[PDB]
Amino acid sequence: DGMKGAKMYEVVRVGELGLIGEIIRLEGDKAVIQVYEETAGVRPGEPVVGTGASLSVELGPRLLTSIYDGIQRPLEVIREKTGDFIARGVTAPALPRDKKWHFIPKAKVGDKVVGGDIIGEVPETSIIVHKIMVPPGIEGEIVEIAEEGDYTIEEVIAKVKTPSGEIKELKMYQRWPVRVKRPYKEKLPPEVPLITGQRVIDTFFPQAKGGTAAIPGPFGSAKTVTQHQLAKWSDAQVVIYIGCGERGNEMTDVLEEFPKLKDPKTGKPLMERTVLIANTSNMPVAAREASIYTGITIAEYFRDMGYDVALMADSTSRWAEALREISGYPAYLASKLAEFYERAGRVVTLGSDYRVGSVSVIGAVSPPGGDFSEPVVQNTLRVVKVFWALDADLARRRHFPAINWLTSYSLYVDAVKDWWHKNIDPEWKAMRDKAMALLQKESELQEIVRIVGPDALPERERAILLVARMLREDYLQQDAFDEVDTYCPPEKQVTMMRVLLNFYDKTMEAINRGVPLEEIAKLPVREEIGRMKFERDVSKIRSLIDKTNEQFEELFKKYGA
């Protein structure tokens, strides 16, 4: 199958990324056909045909509840050689041309439109209403519009007369070149947080809507469930998961053991608002490289409707073969990785109406074995604004989420504070700061203690260690498997925070009035505080502030004045 061209320097089975020609001809080739670098004059080698289209994607109904390969193809049955169910990639369509979709019209004849305007709605799943949009670059008068009825994606549902008089035929689906970012009016600054409902993240290391985050690879895909928790609970309407299986028999679990997963907000399946894109070891290198662009483009298309969408990537060892070298070492790959993360953001979308959408990207990276800088995570940490550091030692101590509070960071704390301050609690940022200071003090203290023993420690230092422990056990720790604590609403987060910090205030007060710490560690309210996370009524939690005050006051009257 591989012919002339100095014996093709790369893979030739069903792969891509071909570079024949003269000047600076880049990539792109399906089997033998693809134009990405303006063909007309690049035929060297064996017969190269080329249709003038680029690496498109096709965007419309049935993008949801769909598993694709890295360039969008099928949900394939397949089999196994010796292991379990695997994926190769079948050249099929992308969206069923036969399925009848229900089109609700949103415009009458004579309406002036621009690229982005919503001309119709299609109930795609029980969750997501699909929004049919005028493709970017198209504007004018609606001369013809469909009627409340059932149609397939290939049917023309609208016609637009452009300023020059050109009549444009527009359908329910639309192609867009991956590698070119879907346009928008404006990229908004980070301001609204992506609410995970996980205390440690939402409080100490927030993710912004349109933000960029990463989670490391000391893997234990089974030692961490935070990835799932993020997918289920984050207040994005649509999820695009690049399920890079390649990890034992992951693809088997990632296959038809996902439709059992329940979207906890609706009760319906999680798939009815999710698009899967597989990256197995039985796929071409280039069909993996293109996957993130296929993913991000489907993400961008959804935010254009005015949806918040989360894009979760999966590295699990994906360093491209890229054996070919000709022009010094081309170690510029970090730039295209930036190009990718650069496409993330909350934007004012196209359209006549003011409409906002976002694409938040959770990276989730992994180096070869140990040493977190070889060099995938090294480059990524320089690009992302948030890192949640999954720690194996923390996982062994059954501290969950195993998010290390000392090595994690988010550069969105200032960006999201005002939202928290205006909508939830005026003291939000003051409280996480104070809580972080406590946790930093503990870290310093526990180093010293390790050396010089716990004995010499004064009461004040023990008091800080007591409350730090509470902070770690009562707040940082969260039960993903509990009916109540699987999700913690903003309003609950700040309340739980208030009780803990108020107990701290009252502790340092009591110590300052010569109350022994052994007495405060015995205080009844403490064990109620340790239970908060399982109480669903925020008013009941809030009442522990008074209950604390009372018991501390009752402790003052047992002593002097």
Side-chain angles (χ1 to χ4, degrees):
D1 55 0
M3 273 61 252
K4 267 276 190 288
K7 205 193 97 288
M8 20 57 76
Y9 318 96
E10 60 148 41
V11 203
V12 175
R13 48 185 72 257
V14 61
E16 13 179 299
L17 278 249
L19 35 286
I20 217 86
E22 48 262 60
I23 327 160
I24 179 74
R25 255 61 201 173
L26 296 174
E27 334 298 323
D29 49 341
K30 199 278 284 179
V32 275
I33 337 98
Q34 164 63 212
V35 182
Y36 165 73
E37 287 283 73
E38 327 292 310
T39 31
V42 282
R43 307 203 81 174
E46 216 60 49
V48 172
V49 285
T51 44
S54 294
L55 305 89
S56 60
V57 128
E58 179 173 322
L59 299 151
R62 251 296 295 265
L63 273 168
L64 301 179
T65 71
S66 297
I67 311 155
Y68 296 112
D69 71 314
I71 59 158
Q72 178 159 184
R73 273 135 71 168
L75 79 159
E76 42 183 357
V77 55
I78 316 295
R79 28 74 225 273
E80 45 259 64
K81 182 188 175 179
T82 308
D84 215 331
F85 284 98
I86 217 140
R88 184 54 54 101
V90 176
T91 308
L95 286 52
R97 314 283 175 178
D98 48 286
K99 184 155 170 59
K100 280 191 165 206
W101 294 105
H102 191 89
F103 173 84
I104 313 272
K106 288 298 163 175
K108 54 180 186 284
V109 175
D111 283 349
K112 287 227 277 76
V113 286
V114 290
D117 276 313
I118 304 167
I119 48 171
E121 291 183 9
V122 176
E124 189 184 359
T125 66
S126 50
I127 306 156
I128 297 297
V129 173
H130 206 288
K131 305 279 187 179
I132 303 305
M133 298 180 290
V134 185
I138 283 86
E139 45 180 289
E141 185 196 1
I142 278 112
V143 287
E144 206 154 35
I145 187 75
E147 195 152 277
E148 166 76 289
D150 296 52
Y151 318 99
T152 70
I153 64 155
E154 283 291 356
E155 307 197 34
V156 164
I157 89 291
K159 289 186 182 176
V160 168
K161 195 225 289 178
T162 77
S164 75
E166 223 169 339
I167 300 279
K168 278 298 197 298
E169 295 191 316
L170 58 169
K171 307 173 193 168
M172 287 183 292
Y173 79 95
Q174 45 144 111
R175 285 168 190 83
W176 182 263
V178 312
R179 236 152 221 171
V180 165
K181 64 183 192 174
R182 302 206 82 233
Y184 49 82
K185 282 191 190 167
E186 186 196 344
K187 182 93 94 189
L188 294 174
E191 58 156 327
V192 180
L194 185 61
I195 305 296
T196 327
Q198 316 309 295
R199 293 190 281 280
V200 64
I201 292 176
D202 292 356
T203 310
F204 301 108
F205 319 102
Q207 159 74 312
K209 280 189 168 70
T212 49
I215 342 182
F219 262 103
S221 193
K223 302 179 194 72
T224 79
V225 291
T226 333
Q227 69 284 333
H228 279 66
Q229 285 285 83
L230 285 150
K232 303 191 311 165
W233 288 111
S234 304
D235 68 330
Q237 291 82 225
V238 175
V239 181
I240 279 81
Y241 193 82
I242 205 285
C244 182
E246 208 249 32
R247 176 63 78 259
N249 289 147
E250 189 188 303
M251 185 68 206
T252 317
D253 303 315
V254 168
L255 222 178
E256 210 140 297
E257 209 154 56
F258 249 98
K260 279 189 177 179
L261 267 79
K262 44 270 175 177
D263 178 39
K265 296 165 167 285
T266 56
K268 283 99 168 200
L270 198 74
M271 278 298 193
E272 287 198 17
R273 44 163 268 185
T274 315
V275 184
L276 275 197
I277 289 153
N279 263 17
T280 64
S281 58
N282 302 51
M283 305 203 333
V285 173
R288 299 188 190 100
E289 180 274 340
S291 66
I292 59 164
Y293 306 100
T294 298
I296 204 93
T297 304
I298 303 167
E300 283 165 3
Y301 169 70
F302 275 101
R303 63 122 213 254
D304 287 358
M305 311 182 202
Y307 287 121
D308 299 297
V309 32
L311 179 105
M312 335 223 317
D314 199 22
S315 183
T316 180
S317 304
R318 204 92 308 183
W319 85 295
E321 62 150 11
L323 62 94
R324 189 82 319 274
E325 303 172 65
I326 295 169
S327 47
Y329 208 101
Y332 98 123
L333 309 319
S335 71
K336 77 146 71 188
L337 195 61
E339 197 103 321
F340 162 74
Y341 279 100
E342 176 222 60
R343 285 170 72 165
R346 200 165 89 112
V347 305
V348 177
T349 72
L350 300 178
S352 305
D353 65 283
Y354 187 88
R355 188 158 84 218
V356 182
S358 48
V359 173
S360 315
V361 177
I362 313 175
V365 302
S366 46
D371 207 308
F372 284 79
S373 58
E374 225 70 56
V376 281
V377 51
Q378 187 193 53
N379 280 339
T380 310
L381 293 171
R382 197 170 66 253
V383 180
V384 296
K385 309 300 161 191
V386 188
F387 181 53
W388 304 310
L390 256 30
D391 189 295
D393 201 283
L394 227 50
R396 298 186 223 112
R397 285 140 80 93
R398 299 330 233 286
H399 180 285
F400 300 109
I403 294 168
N404 192 298
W405 55 95
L406 265 15
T407 72
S408 288
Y409 68 88
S410 163
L411 303 171
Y412 295 132
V413 178
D414 285 302
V416 305
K417 74 193 173 189
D418 208 45
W419 183 93
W420 280 98
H421 292 321
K422 170 163 64 183
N423 296 102
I424 318 295
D425 199 306
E427 262 27 74
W428 177 79
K429 163 75 159 57
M431 291 195 169
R432 59 85 68 208
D433 281 1
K434 195 177 175 169
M436 184 55 71
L438 258 326
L439 287 178
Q440 256 130 219
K441 229 292 174 173
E442 177 183 49
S443 196
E444 300 157 31
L445 279 183
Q446 230 142 34
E447 253 279 63
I448 303 167
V449 160
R450 192 190 66 77
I451 306 159
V452 301
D455 308 286
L457 227 48
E459 290 265 287
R460 150 154 165 150
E461 260 56 35
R462 303 186 85 221
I464 292 154
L465 284 188
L466 209 208
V467 181
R469 174 159 177 176
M470 289 176 69
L471 262 169
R472 299 191 336 271
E473 294 174 339
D474 308 345
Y475 197 91
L476 270 62
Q477 280 180 234
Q478 198 165 165
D479 203 343
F481 302 84
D482 181 277
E483 294 177 348
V484 174
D485 204 43
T486 183
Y487 180 82
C488 189
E491 40 272 74
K492 189 183 166 184
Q493 292 189 38
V494 291
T495 309
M496 283 178 64
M497 181 50 79
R498 273 225 162 82
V499 185
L500 282 160
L501 291 192
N502 178 63
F503 186 94
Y504 173 71
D505 291 333
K506 289 288 173 175
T507 297
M508 309 308 274
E509 192 179 306
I511 257 72
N512 204 217
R513 319 222 305 201
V515 177
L517 183 72
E518 317 210 337
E519 206 79 55
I520 297 163
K522 283 172 190 174
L523 249 63
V525 66
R526 263 202 60 208
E527 86 80 34
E528 283 177 82
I529 288 159
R531 281 202 265 101
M532 284 183 201
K533 58 166 79 79
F534 303 117
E535 173 58 70
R536 69 172 85 250
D537 200 329
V538 178
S539 159
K540 269 157 187 268
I541 305 168
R542 199 181 278 98
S543 76
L544 290 169
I545 300 162
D546 297 339
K547 204 168 183 179
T548 294
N549 298 342
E550 289 148 11
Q551 292 180 30
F552 266 98
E553 199 60 47
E554 285 144 49
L555 215 67
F556 296 131
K557 87 169 288 177
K558 194 198 170 182
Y559 292 80

